[PDB]
Enzyme design. Structure first.
Site, mmCIF file in Angstrom:
data_model
loop_
_atom_site.group_PDB
_atom_site.id
_atom_site.type_symbol
_atom_site.label_atom_id
_atom_site.label_comp_id
_atom_site.label_asym_id
_atom_site.label_seq_id
_atom_site.Cartn_x
_atom_site.Cartn_y
_atom_site.Cartn_z
ATOM 1 C CG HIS A 1 31.890 -34.235 28.455
ATOM 2 N ND1 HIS A 1 31.964 -33.253 28.431
ATOM 3 C CD2 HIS A 1 33.097 -35.054 27.789
ATOM 4 C CE1 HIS A 1 32.233 -33.367 26.712
ATOM 5 N NE2 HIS A 1 33.097 -34.326 27.163
ATOM 6 C CD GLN B 1 30.410 -38.471 20.237
ATOM 7 O OE1 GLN B 1 30.416 -38.187 18.787
ATOM 8 N NE2 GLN B 1 30.051 -37.570 20.815
ATOM 9 N N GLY B 2 35.741 -36.510 20.508
ATOM 10 C CA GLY B 2 37.099 -36.251 20.450
ATOM 11 C C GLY B 2 37.339 -35.232 19.920
ATOM 12 C CG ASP B 3 36.041 -32.299 17.128
ATOM 13 O OD1 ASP B 3 36.839 -32.313 17.136
ATOM 14 O OD2 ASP B 3 35.081 -32.565 16.206
ATOM 15 C CB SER B 4 34.470 -33.267 24.564
ATOM 16 O OG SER B 4 33.321 -33.508 24.144
ATOM 17 C CG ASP C 1 30.586 -30.674 29.661
ATOM 18 O OD1 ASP C 1 31.858 -31.003 30.634
ATOM 19 O OD2 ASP C 1 30.650 -30.543 28.628
#
Length: 224
Positions: A41, A177-180, A84
């Site tokens: 993603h 969020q931003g760690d993905s 993912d």
């Protein structure tokens, strides 16, 4: 990362930051000199020219070695939140040495054991909804949550055999969020997953959900 602490130099020799359009975006893991593992993603369908990888630094904005992307391959069965993972090929090869090294991957077919400790790291938000992001890498240790408990939280069909969960029942420690795309490692520092999704960040009774390296090793091995 919510509830974390600063990473030290050399804690994650393989971690990379992934910027997009000059801003923070995702994390990833260096597999070899020209290959990064991240979440699908983070990259699927976006213009590849917008991304930059940085290796060999605790900071997402300075230091280390950078590279643009040459190609992106998403798992052939990526759909919704499922499967993912993506493989990125780099335009610039990154040699190991110093604070850079390549990840050791979980065994094909392995599944993290509930109750075992795992460590997640990244440059993402430090609160749900936070707009600021740290310059330097943070990490947090959380237990693996059984898939059965995770299904109780999210629904039976929502948690597949290509996902695993981690977190603390009372919340407070999680990826965000931003760690993905960034790494979750077991207590030996073996790469077991990539940050994928969850219901907010660090909420009680809603675990973080991770894409399983063990489950998806056939794909990784093909294109790495």
């Amino acid at each position: 990362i919510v509830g974390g602490t600063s990473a030290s130099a050399g804690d994650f020799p393989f971690i990379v930051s992934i910027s997009r359009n000059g801003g923070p975006w995702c994390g990833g893991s260096l597999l070899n000199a020209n290959t990064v593992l991240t979440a699908a993603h983070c990259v699927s369908g976006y213009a590849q020219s917008g991304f930059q990888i940085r290796a060999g630094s605790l900071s997402r904005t300075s230091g280390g070695i950078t590279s643009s992307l040459s190609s992106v391959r998403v798992h052939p069965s990526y759909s919704g939140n499922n499967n993912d993972l993506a493989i990125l090929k780099l335009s610039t090869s990154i040699p190991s040495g110093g604070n850079i090294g390549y990840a050791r991957l979980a065994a094909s077919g392995s599944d993290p054991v509930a109750g075992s400790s795992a460590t997640v790291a990244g440059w993402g938000a430090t609160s749900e909804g936070g707009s600021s992001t740290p310059v330097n890498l943070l990490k947090v240790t959380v237990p693996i949550v059984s898939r059965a408990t995770c299904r109780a939280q999210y629904g039976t069909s929502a948690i597949t055999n290509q996902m695993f969960c981690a977190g603390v029942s009372s919340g407070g420690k999680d990826s965000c969020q931003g760690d993905s795309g960034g790494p979750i490692v077991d207590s030996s520092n073996t790469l077991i997953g990539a940050v994928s999704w969850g219901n907010g960040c660090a909420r009680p009774n809603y675990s973080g959900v991770y894409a399983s390296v063990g489950a998806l090793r056939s794909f990784i091995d093909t294109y790495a």
